[PDB]
Symmetry: C2
Subunit: 348 residues, 2 copies
């Protein structure tokens, strides 16, 4: 029997991927409390997990765009100093959270901290209370530059602890398929993208043609043009062109089996979801920390990275080497230790 | 890797207790779909699980109060024929669900059906597709009279399958503490009572006095009188007297540690939650199928069954043999195989 404080981020893409490990712990009789920004409350409880706020509502730009001196900052265009820029942001996110996260941990008294590799509030609280912590990667590829730049930014707070670095994690968990890439432990990625639900009709019925999921237009533009390549399009988003079948937020992990191509923003969760379900992807990456995962993906032949989108879909629609690679990777991930397996590791 | 269809009921008390086993399966890499009445949708998705409806919105009285001929029925006053009355109700609930549940299972193709002992739609669908099924008890005590009366009511549908009874479950799971009571397997009860959340302030802070949780008044009446026995009262319900601290729905399993007495309706989930947290209970039972669990509870000295409520609370407030027994039982349950343990059993 254990008490694990899960210290999460301020956006859904950084919270949801910790849900399956959190429930794996709870399923093994342990006590779990997920701590995150106030605005993540509904996401945490919507996953059926206990929630406690560590700071008022927040988004990353808020903290990425101003440095510790209160001076505005700007995006480096070169990739490397951009990675460090991002890292320092994640470091400053800690400053918004640590007070309430530490106070909470003193009242709740966890044996263990579970956290995401860029959620540095975890390692800090752990180091402060002198308890072990676990690190989970929620990305195909997580630049060490981001983490190290983040630790750097936290230099003063680590000095108050008489430290220059964070104590090592009990476990450091990785979800990247081996054939696609460190003191780490592999783990199978179990998708969690859900909020509400009703696995729509068509998902359980037949597919009479190639299906594609999309997740002054762009969204509306791709929605009209894409069916002309011979696709039936479903658009899984929150916010009626002829070739599109569906409109609204769908359980992405439950709708996945019902299609043959996914076009998306390059998000970490969506990427890993598609991989684990063996569905070829067209990734149009935006955020910089996802660049590395889209490259890995492109090289593996499981999808196309588009730094035109129509071209990639037609290419995949005709070249069967993409489904083949996607399914190969899915099958590879399926051999990895499940979250339930990892819990047994943790408890020893 | 497995595909498990979880076939649940039409009320929250019959759905929520299957959530931890369902997530234990998902944590072990398996695929899960919870099938229940339309009105259980939000409860299922609110637990972070995939949902599919097997019939329109429904409540038990609807189906308990009319027999198969369309004739109104009435409550027997004697306990035994009342048990059979209840059983036939659960049997007729199957008739509302089986069509959409079977159609769903044919499209989804499960390897396994997980269900609650009185949710007889499960065993039927399983028997129909020729696949194994698992039975979980969600009660301290589950009269065989209810189950058998239910199987009886389904005599015709089992004849279409060339059967007089349901094929035996792969596993038959039981959650009653041994010292408190069959081809069954013990399992530790992991509480799930949640919807939304924010483990309120006072739960993590100190308790300056004995705390009691309550879950033309009754609720308002007990709320005013109970503080006069020396209690600070919190009322965990959906729908300002001096001695009461809090007003609204709380994560019952997370608020539990913060109190010394619980007074409640005798529900199955609330009872097991209190037991597992070692908190003495005053049970004022209503529903008939919960009678057996309140008796078991009273005999074990872990709480008082009130078929006056103030008397029981003062009795517990002064007699330390109640906390002692409650904690003894909690400690006993804590030695039982977790839901994660049971999944390993299932997969062999």
């Amino acid at each position: 029997h254990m008490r694990i404080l899960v210290i999460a981020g301020c956006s859904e893409g950084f919270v949801m991927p910790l849900v399956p490990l959190s429930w794996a712990l709870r399923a093994a009789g342990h006590e779990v409390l997920v701590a995150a920004s106030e605005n993540m409350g509904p996401t945490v409880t919507g996953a059926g997990l206990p929630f406690a706020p560590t700071c008022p509502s927040l988004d990353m730009p808020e903290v990425l765009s101003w440095d510790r001196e209160g001076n505005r900052t700007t995006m480096p265009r070169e990739e490397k100093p951009l990675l460090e820029h991002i890292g320092r942001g994640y470091g400053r996110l800690v400053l918004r959270m640590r007070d309430e996260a530490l106070a909470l941990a003193e009242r709740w008294k966890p044996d263990l901290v579970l956290t995401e590799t860029y959620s540095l509030t975890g390692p800090l609280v752990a180091a402060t209370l002198g308890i072990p912590w676990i690190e989970q990667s929620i990305r195909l590829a997580s630049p060490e530059l981001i983490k190290s730049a983040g630790v750097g930014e936290l230099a003063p707070e680590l000095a108050e602890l008489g430290l220059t670095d964070f104590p090592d994690p009990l476990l450091s968990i990785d979800v990247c398929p081996p054939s696609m890439e460190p003191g780490t432990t592999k783990m199978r990625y179990v998708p969690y993208n859900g909020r509400n639900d009703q696995v729509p009709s068509w998902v359980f019925e037949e597919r009479k043609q190639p299906r594609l999921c999309l997740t002054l237009s762009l969204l509306q533009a791709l929605s009209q043009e894409l069916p002309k390549l011979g696709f039936e399009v479903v658009v899984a988003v929150s916010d009626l062109p002829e070739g599109v079948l569906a409109a609204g937020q769908f359980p992405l992990s439950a709708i996945m089996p019902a299609c043959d191509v996914v076009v998306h923003h390059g998000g970490h969760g969506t990427t890993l979801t598609c991989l684990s379900e063996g569905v070829p992807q067209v990734s149009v990456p935006v955020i910089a920390e996802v660049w590395d995962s889209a490259r890995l993906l492109h090289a593996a032949g499981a999808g196309v990275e588009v730094p035109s989108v129509l071209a990639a879909c037609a290419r995949i629609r005709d070249d069967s080497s993409y489904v083949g690679n996607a399914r190969r990777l899915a099958a590879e991930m399926a051999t990895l230790p499940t979250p339930a397996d990892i819990v047994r590791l943790i408890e020893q």
